[PDB]
């Protein structure tokens, strides 16, 4: 009877190169068109690539194309998807079908499909609340950045003026950096860190970034922005 | 003073390579650690790579690692961000730092900034209702498809038994394939379709998914999850 037989599955690192094959057999290889059609662990159905019968047109979805190729070989009756520079987000069971004729509208006979898997290749994620605060000038703003592990102080406080690059205002959680007045003041220790820009200037009001460096790799917070209302 | 000039911003397509240069002056550049950090626009800041200052220790975020390069010229006074393999997310102005040692903790000058774009390289979406259906076996089981545009009844229905590879049922969105029993029924056309299973047998609690071929590329639907209760 008509039958597909699929091979080339298995785990792959991100950016490398797979290639996986579908031998046909009952059928006119050479006179239907072929499709690729892979689906996620859990998801639906995603088509990936149609190629003509004499394999001179291919077309192929907008997020596989420019990396993935599909060809034929009509002596060998075969069927090939070429997947180059992975992503994770490429982590499917890849099905090869036959077209229902030459013209690659729908298909009637599916391959059994084959697991491709790509991965994989800890951290302190710090937490900044509020993510915006509301105030006027001569008020004072409070911080907060919390880690998830302990960093025994070891955290640095970045000011970002928009349209600007950041510029480092403390490190340490404590130390002031040389041209940052006492308004601004770090503090905290452990897991729990706080930052207080007492009576606001005008200039004061930016986007405000803590950084852990006790463990690897360095870390950002989401940051907080102190607008004016 | 102490200055960091930047260069290598543009447009490029995903895939492609692109290198960035941080000109050094005003210290001195063997002497410090050297960080480069990205930010999305709109969203914070995102710590990217850190290097020795002789060069020999080189350490990335988990994001960027395996497909990125940090290097340094002692002699030239210059950093370099290799950027290989580009994905869309990688679209961020990219700030190179100097840190405040050798140590590599955290950074107080910055470069100004050049900017990363990743783009770019109509469709017809179909969505299914409902998500998933409880019904009894000799129940009857009703499920739409909705096409964004109109597909001139170019629609199929497809059924996939877990575990198992889809099948076919309906093309053209009336007819009903060979081997599948009139209890299935196709109906619709322009934006609107549905499948109708009469008198739920066991075998019919499956996945549905619906696909349209009026326009390129050709797309599935979210599917329908037809289980017992």
């Known amino acids: 009877q008509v039958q597909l037989q699929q091979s080339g599955g298995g785990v792959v690192q991100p950016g490398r190169s797979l290639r996986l094959s579908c031998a046909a057999s009952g059928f006119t290889f050479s006179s239907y068109a072929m499709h690729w059609v892979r689906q996620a662990p859990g998801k639906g159905l995603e088509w990936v690539a149609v190629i003509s019968h004499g394999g001179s047109n291919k077309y192929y979805a907008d997020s596989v194309k420019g990396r993935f190729t599909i060809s034929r070989d009509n002596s060998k009756n075969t069927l090939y998807l070429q997947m180059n520079s992975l992503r994770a987000e490429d982590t499917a069971v890849?099905?090869?079908?036959?077209?229902?004729?030459?013209?690659?509208?729908?298909?009637?006979?599916?391959?059994?499909g084959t697991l491709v898997t790509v991965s994989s290749g800890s951290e302190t994620t710090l937490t900044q609340s509020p993510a915006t605060l509301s105030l006027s000038p001569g008020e004072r703003a409070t911080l907060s950045c919390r880690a998830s592990q302990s960093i025994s102080s070891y955290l640095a406080w970045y000011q970002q003026k928009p349209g600007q690059a950041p510029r480092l205002l403390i490190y340490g959680a404590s130390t002031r950096a040389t041209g940052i007045p006492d308004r601004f003041s770090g503090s905290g220790s452990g897991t729990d860190f706080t930052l207080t820009i007492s009576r606001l200037e005008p200039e004061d009001f930016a986007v405000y970034y803590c950084?852990?460096?006790?463990?690897?790799?360095?870390?950002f917070g989401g940051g907080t922005k102190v607008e004016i209302k | 003073q102490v200055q960091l000039q930047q260069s290598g911003g543009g447009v490029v397509q995903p895939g492609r390579s692109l290198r960035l240069s941080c000109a050094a002056s005003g210290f001195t550049f063997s002497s410090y650690a050297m960080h480069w950090v990205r930010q999305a626009p709109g969203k914070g800041l995102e710590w990217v790579a850190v290097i020795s200052h002789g060069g020999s220790n080189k350490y990335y975020a988990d994001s960027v690692k395996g497909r990125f390069t940090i290097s340094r010229d002692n002699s030239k006074n210059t950093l370099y961000l290799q950027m290989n393999s580009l994905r869309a997310e990688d679209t961020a102005v990219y700030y190179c730092?100097?840190?405040?040692?050798?140590?590599?903790?955290?950074?107080?000058?910055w470069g100004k900034g050049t900017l990363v774009t990743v783009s770019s390289g109509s469709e017809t979406t179909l969505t299914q209702s409902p998500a998933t259906l409880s019904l009894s076996p000799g129940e009857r089981a009703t499920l739409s498809c909705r096409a964004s545009q109109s597909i001139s009844s170019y629609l199929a229905w497809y059924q996939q038994k877990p575990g198992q590879a889809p099948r076919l049922l309906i093309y053209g969105a009336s007819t009903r394939a060979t081997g599948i029993p009139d209890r299935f029924s196709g109906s619709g056309s322009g934006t609107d379709f549905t499948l109708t299973i009469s008198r739920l047998e066991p075998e019919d609690f499956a996945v549905?998914?619906?696909?349209?071929?009026?326009?390129?590329?050709?797309?599935?639907?979210?599917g329908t999850k037809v289980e017992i209760k």
């Open positions: 950084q852990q460096y006790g463990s690897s790799p360095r870390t």
């Open positions: 730092a100097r840190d405040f040692s050798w140590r590599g903790y955290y950074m107080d000058v």
